[PDB]
């Protein structure tokens, strides 16, 4: 009794509602690995590394305290089941 | 006349030259009580 | 397996749809007019962006501590007061003298240590300076040195850094007097770009173990000594490479360019565009960036093909990412 | 699961038609302007 | 080129952008001084 | 360029100009040369 | 108005030109 | 002289006397 209508509806709802609003975002750079320079206004915080990797911001005047992470990569600040809460493959969790 | 957090781990704060107040005096106007947030004596 | 079956079907359908969306995006972007339209749309979006709350972007010399930063502010104010009446040749002499004094201090570790140690009174420092080099430097140079040593510096190295800064300011001022500030800005940015493109050359130039004269000669023979190089930019770059203490050559050139633009009060905005912009587009971008950041901004273009459209601006530690490629990546990762 | 597999294959084959439309819509969102293709 | 050289004996330095995929910063990685190294 | 070797004498005068110590850490006191290493002697700014 | 060939030639010419501390050909950038 | 010893020529740093 697979409702092909449901399968179509999920994806069309995702596509139609898709939105990625550009935002003024503060970035740092990995200096070694993984210390991050920059991110002047990071909280004592969840950071995003390329490939969607997640890290946790040890703050010093110099620098802040799994896909490949390399020196020079750009690190973004988020401004805020594996321990992250992501399911690990029954599907997304509301 | 107000400090500003410098290191966070034990918060190393930095004050103007004459307004140093705080569990230690690291010297060079730094005491060891988001970086850059102002701290008042 | 039921819910797993729906999950598999949704995953396959979404993957195929997003792959075709990427294909369509790339096909549409093929047209240069499409690139222009995307840039215009992103600019339109920028006009709606709220002005930055942190009007204090600074970051030109953020590495300086509060004490040394205030001392350098006083020193640059004194230099601005002094240089008003000095002539172009006088400015060149001042810059050369300051560079020589900076290298002398760097060589003589003990002298710099003694002359940079903070103290309530400065008269002993002034007397030491006068005894050392009262005659070897002009009156304006000696006044600048005495003002510099009167203040206090967090670290002895900050003193030589400040002297180098004053030399750079003198060179920039003589460039301004001739009315060639924009030309020297462009030349400095181009030199930084080429140094970045040739990391081997920068690494060779970015060592202080070898004699400074040899590195300056290499710079002249390779990059600086060319028919089209502006004289002021040549002198500034040669002086900077002569006085290197572990800073990367390309980083030093970028810092020189940033300081040059700062003297005008502007701020450098490194806009990475998919293709070249139009004059109207450039003016609109400058206006929107200036109003949002609250200060006039000089825009440096870095044409990058894989951006695929839009722009990617960066000022200080802040980045505004309008690249179409970023949208495609988000769509890829945004699947349920 | 053979019967479930049969429904899965049949339904994915059937949905292979409308999929194109979705792609276009998605493009329109990331291009920011409607794309007819 | 884009090939590093041995710095410390091993800490190997690479040109910027050529760092092989422990990174110590300043383009060094940890894996006669100055010998040619390739990745 | 410029060079000088007699500077060795000049600096002496400067250091000969100045004993009072100043607290830098807390406690370490800089100064008191004739009084524990070169940097300092084993409230900041006090004399 | 810059040619990478000129840069390569100049840097190679300079490299030829100027070519426990010391013992470079003997362990780190400072000393053995 | 003694520093904590200093001799004319690690760095010879092997007060004021």
Numbering used by the authors:
A (entry chain A): 5 to 37, 42 to 52, 54 to 66, 68 to 75, 82 to 96, 111 to 118, 120 to 125
B (entry chain E): 8 to 16, 19 to 30, 53 to 64, 74 to 81
C (entry chain d): 109 to 444
D (entry chain b): 130 to 166
E (entry chain D): 7 to 15, 20 to 31, 55 to 64, 74 to 81
F (entry chain B): 5 to 22, 30 to 37, 42 to 50, 69 to 75, 86 to 90
G (entry chain C): 5 to 23, 44 to 50, 69 to 74
H (entry chain F): 11 to 14, 22 to 26, 58 to 62, 75 to 77
Excerpt from the paper describing this PDB structure:
The membrane domain of the mycobacterial ATP synthase is embedded in the IPM, with the catalytic F1-domain of the enzyme extending into the bacterial cytoplasm and attached to the membrane domain by a central stalk and a peripheral stalk (PS). As do other ATP synthases in eubacteria, chloroplasts, and mitochondria, the enzyme couples a proton-motive force (pmf) across the IPM generated by respiration to the synthesis in the F1-domain of the enzyme of ATP from adenosine diphosphate (ADP) and phosphate by a mechanical rotary mechanism. The mycobacterial rotor consists of a membrane-bound ring of nine c-subunits, attached to an elongated central stalk, made of single copies of the γ- and ε-subunits. The mycobacterial PS is made of two proteins, bδ and b′.
Third, we have demonstrated that the fused bδ-subunit contains a duplicated domain in its N-terminal region where the two copies of the domain participate in similar modes of attachment of the two of three N-terminal regions of the α-subunits. In the structure of the M. smegmatis ATP synthase, the PS is a complex of a single b′-subunit (similar to b′-subunits in bacteria and chloroplasts) and the unique bδ-subunit. In the current structure, the bδ-subunit consists of 16 α-helices with a β-strand separating bδH14 and bδH15, with three additional β-strands between bδH15 and bδH16. These structural elements form three separate domains. The N-terminal “b” domain is similar to those of other bacterial b-subunits. Then, bδH4 to bδH8 form a separate domain, named the “linking domain,” which is attached to bδH9 in the third domain, named “the δ-domain,” consisting of bδH9 to bδH16. The δ-domain is similar to the canonical δ-subunits in other eubacteria. However, a feature not remarked on previously is that the bδH4 to bδH8 linking domain can be superimposed onto the δ-domain by a clockwise rotation of ca.120°. Therefore, the δ- and linking domains appear to have arisen by a process that involves a gene duplication event at some point during evolution. Thus, the bδ-subunit has two structurally related domains and each binds to the N-terminal region of an α-subunit (subunits α2 and α3) in a similar fashion with the third α-subunit attached by a different mode.
